Paper text:
Bacterial DNA gyrase and DNA topoisomerase IV (topo IV), both type II topoisomerases, responsible for the ATP-driven introduction of negative supercoils into DNA and ATP-driven supercoil relaxation and decatenation, respectively, are validated antibacterial targets. Gyrase is a heterotetramer of GyrA and GyrB subunits (A2B2), while topo IV is a heterotetramer of ParC and ParE subunits (C2E2). We have developed compounds with a promising activity against Acinetobacter baumannii and Pseudomonas aeruginosa, which are both on the WHO priority list of antibiotic-resistant bacteria. Cocrystal structures of 1 in complex with Escherichia coli GyrB24 and (S)-27 in complex with A. baumannii GyrB23 and P. aeruginosa GyrB24 revealed their binding to the ATP-binding pocket of the GyrB subunit.
Interestingly, compound 27 was the only compound in the whole series showing activity against the novobiocin-resistant A. baumannii mutant GyrB R150C (MIC = 8 μg/mL), which resides mainly in the (S)-enantiomer, as confirmed by several independent experiments. Hydrophobic interactions were formed between the pyrrole moiety and Val57, Ala61, Val85, Val181, and Val134, while the hydrophobic α-methylbenzyl group at position 4 of the benzothiazole core interacted with Ile92, Ala104, and Ile108. Important interactions are hydrogen bonds formed with Asp87 in A. baumannii (Asp73 in E. coli, Asp75 in P. aeruginosa), the conserved water molecule, Asn60 in A. baumannii (Asn46 in E. coli, Asn48 in P. aeruginosa), Gly 95 in A. baumannii (Gly81 in E. coli, Asp83 in P. aeruginosa), and Arg150 in A. baumannii (Arg136 in E. coli, Asp138 in P. aeruginosa) as well as cation−π stacking with Arg90 in A. baumannii (Arg76 in E. coli, Arg78 in P. aeruginosa). Comparing the inhibition of gyrase and topo IV, compound 27 as well as its two enantiomers are better inhibitors of gyrase in E. coli and P. aeruginosa, whereas in A. baumannii, the inhibition of topo IV is better.
Author numbering: 29 to 112, 132 to 231
Write the structure that this text describes.
């Protein structure tokens, strides 16, 4: 039910003007990667602010399940990204979101626009790795400001590194060629 989110985003992501809601978009995706670390599946998270102002979060966890969900008739990954904070809220309020999954020897991908899948999750190659990459462009129709602040992200990643000592958290800002490694 992502229509309701796109109609009243403040109720799901918080303040869409003061920068708190915008950065909550990144935090929600990072929190999913952190949950993979808490369960003992993930020990590296890479958070990138791209030149195009998009943000990528890569983990080396199990990868979001790709098998069809019987109740929905689509990949589990699509059900997680499209049905109702939940990464589906990030998807709903993103002009574009690109999902890559490394799982069971295969690379899977899906792209969305305002949370609508452009095509069903598809196999695009082979991999010896496991994990999830989410890259998203926050919607300017939802957020009055869309530029991520490296200092706001860094402070939260420092906290998460402290609270999750076994996880190597890499922060990259391509706009200023910054890389910081947080690892307790
Ligand atoms: C950056 C990033 N990483 C992840 C990420 O790794 N999530 C994973 N979730 C699972 C998992 O729960 C699924 C079925 C589930 C997720 C949400 C709500 C209800 C259900 C099950 C399994 C499994 O059984 O193997 C694996 C994973 S990995 C997300 Cl989401 C984002 Cl965003
Ligand atoms: Ca620059």
């Amino acid at each position: 039910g992502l229509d309701a989110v796109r109609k009243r985003p403040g109720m799901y992501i918080g303040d869409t003007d003061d920068g708190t809601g915008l950065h909550h978009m990144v935090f929600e995706v990072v929190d999913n990667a952190i949950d993979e670390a808490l369960a003992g599946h993930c020990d590296e998270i890479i958070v990138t602010i791209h030149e195009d102002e998009s943000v990528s979060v890569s983990d080396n966890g199990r990868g979001i399940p790709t098998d069809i969900h019987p109740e929905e008739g689509v990949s589990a990954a699509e059900v997680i990204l499209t049905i109702l904070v939940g990464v589906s809220v990030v998807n709903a309020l993103s002009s574009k979101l690109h999902l890559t999954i490394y799982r069971a020897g295969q690379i899977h991908e899906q792209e969305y626009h305002h949370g609508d899948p452009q095509y069903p999750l598809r196999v695009i190659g082979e991999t010896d790795n496991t994990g999830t990459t989410v890259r998203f462009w926050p919607s300017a129709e939802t957020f009055s400001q869309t530029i991520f602040n490296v200092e706001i992200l860094a402070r939260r990643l420092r906290e998460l590194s402290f609270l999750n000592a076994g996880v190597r958290i890499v922060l990259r800002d391509e706009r200023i060629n910054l890389e910081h490694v947080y690892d307790y």
